[PDB]
Amino acid sequence: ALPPLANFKDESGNEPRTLVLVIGESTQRGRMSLYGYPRETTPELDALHKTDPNLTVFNNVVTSRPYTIEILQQALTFANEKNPDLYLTQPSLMNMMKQAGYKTFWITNQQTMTARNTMLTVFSRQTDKQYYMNQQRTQSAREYDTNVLKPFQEVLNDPAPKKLIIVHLLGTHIKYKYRYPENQGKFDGNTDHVPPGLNAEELESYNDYDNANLYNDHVVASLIKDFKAANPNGFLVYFSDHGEEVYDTPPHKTQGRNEDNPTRHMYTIPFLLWTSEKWQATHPRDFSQDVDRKYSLAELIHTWSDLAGLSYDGYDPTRSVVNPQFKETTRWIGNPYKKNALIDYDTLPYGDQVGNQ
Ligand code: NA
Ligand SMILES: [Zn+2]
């Protein structure tokens, strides 16, 4: 339906490689000990950051929209806040990899209606092979994100030389209590590092979100550990599609996501990159000076093309967070379909708190 990208070039060589893109869900930055949250919510990622020099933690990445399907239309394609409809007239990150000769895979624990024409389904079909692990009635069903590990191990065993693996997690999405098993509520009844003025209902919701962060860390670190245990050639990118306000912002009474009434904790996302030893040897690259760049998830496809070593008509290396030519632009938020409703993310208040900006 769409024409391939013009003047397409692959400069990464022709050796076999496996590239992984982990799409997290609702995980905000300010609630992870990896970014300064005083509760130990991400211990396995913390230790991995201490002992592994190839894990690169990005500290100033925010999303553009706080709703799953509305952000993925921008993150996975050339669309952004100024041109939101480019997911219909330009190729996607999955089309680009197939044009590069990759056998693409889509693994997911989010309920996907394969008989229905949702936009997530259309994205997941653009791959060669799909693994839907959460076919299921609905809310309360209890399908945890470790469902992806066994098929992830199976895709690693596929003998295709060039592989792109996309792992879509339920992450830390509502309802928080159903993201982790019942006997792993480490923060149940805990009241330390809790904002003031919470009732028993708001307190249990707050602690369930940190319990869900704990489990999410286990899943992301396990994907990195299993990938590393295959001694591969390639890298892995983890990002959350958007954040989630959970009584973080004063007066500590708000929970959820609202584009028309935005707070920072809804837009701050983790952004991790793990490069294999073989890939770093063949593509030496220093990322230590990039970790503090102010970056929007809306331009993710340019960072990916850069890392994958791809160039084409439309490739903008100034919007790649790992490129030497990176130039900071305005990190737009707000509904791109309303009349002049775009505002700078930096104008939002409470940027000084730990894990914001
Ligand atoms: Na985009
Ligand atoms: Zn989402």
Which ligand has its closest atom nearest to the C-alpha of 244? Answer: 2
Number of H helices, E strands in the chain: 9, 15
Give the distance (Å) from ligand 2 centre to CA of residue 26: 5
Give the distance (Å) from ligand 1 centre to CA of residue 316: 11
Question: What total number of domains does the chain contain?
Answer: 1
Give the distance (Å) from ligand 1 centre to CA of residue 87: 8
User: 71 near 286, Cβ under 8 Å?
Assistant: no
Cα 330 to Cα 256: distance, rounded to the nearest angstrom: 25
Q: Enumerate residues with CB within 5 Å of ligand 1 (an ion).
A: 74, 77, 79
Residue 224 phi/psi, 5-degree rounding, is -70, -40
Residue 356: inside a domain, yes or no?
Answer: no
Which ligand has its closest atom nearest to the C-alpha of 257? Answer: 2
| Range of the structural domain that residue 274 is part of | 9-347
Give the distance (Å) from ligand 2 centre to CA of residue 175: 13
| CATH code of residue 100 | 3.40.720.10
Residue 39 phi/psi, 5-degree rounding, is -75, 140
Give the distance (Å) from ligand 1 centre to CA of residue 85: 10
Give the distance (Å) from ligand 1 centre to CA of residue 301: 6
Cα 72 to Cα 224: distance, rounded to the nearest angstrom: 22
Give the distance (Å) from ligand 1 centre to CA of residue 116: 24
| CB-neighbour burial class of residue 56 (10 A; exposed 0-12, middle 13-18, buried 19+) | buried
Cα 128 to Cα 142: distance, rounded to the nearest angstrom: 28
Residue 2: inside a domain, yes or no?
Answer: no
Residue 147: inside a domain, yes or no?
Answer: yes
Cα 159 to Cα 162: distance, rounded to the nearest angstrom: 9
Residue 262: inside a domain, yes or no?
Answer: yes
Cα 192 to Cα 347: distance, rounded to the nearest angstrom: 30
Q: Which DSSP string do the residues of 23-55 spell out, in sequence order?
A: EE-S--GGG-GGGT-SS-S-HHHHHHHHH-TTE
Residue 127: both structure tokens together: 């791959």
Residue 1: inside a domain, yes or no?
Answer: no
Q: What is the 3-state secondary structure (H, E, C) of 231-251?
A: CCCCEEEEEECCCCEECCCCC
- Residue whose structure tokens are 């000084």: 352
Residue 4: inside a domain, yes or no?
Answer: no
| Resolution value (Å, 1 decimal) | 2.6
Give the distance (Å) from ligand 2 centre to CA of residue 67: 5
Which ligand has its closest atom nearest to the C-alpha of 174? Answer: 2
Which ligand has its closest atom nearest to the C-alpha of 302? Answer: 1
Residue 354: inside a domain, yes or no?
Answer: no
User: 30 near 355, Cβ under 8 Å?
Assistant: yes
Residue 276: both structure tokens together: 């294999």
Choose among 198, 239, 214: nearest CA to 20. Answer: 239
Residue 220: both structure tokens together: 């992301």
User: 318 near 293, Cβ under 8 Å?
Assistant: no
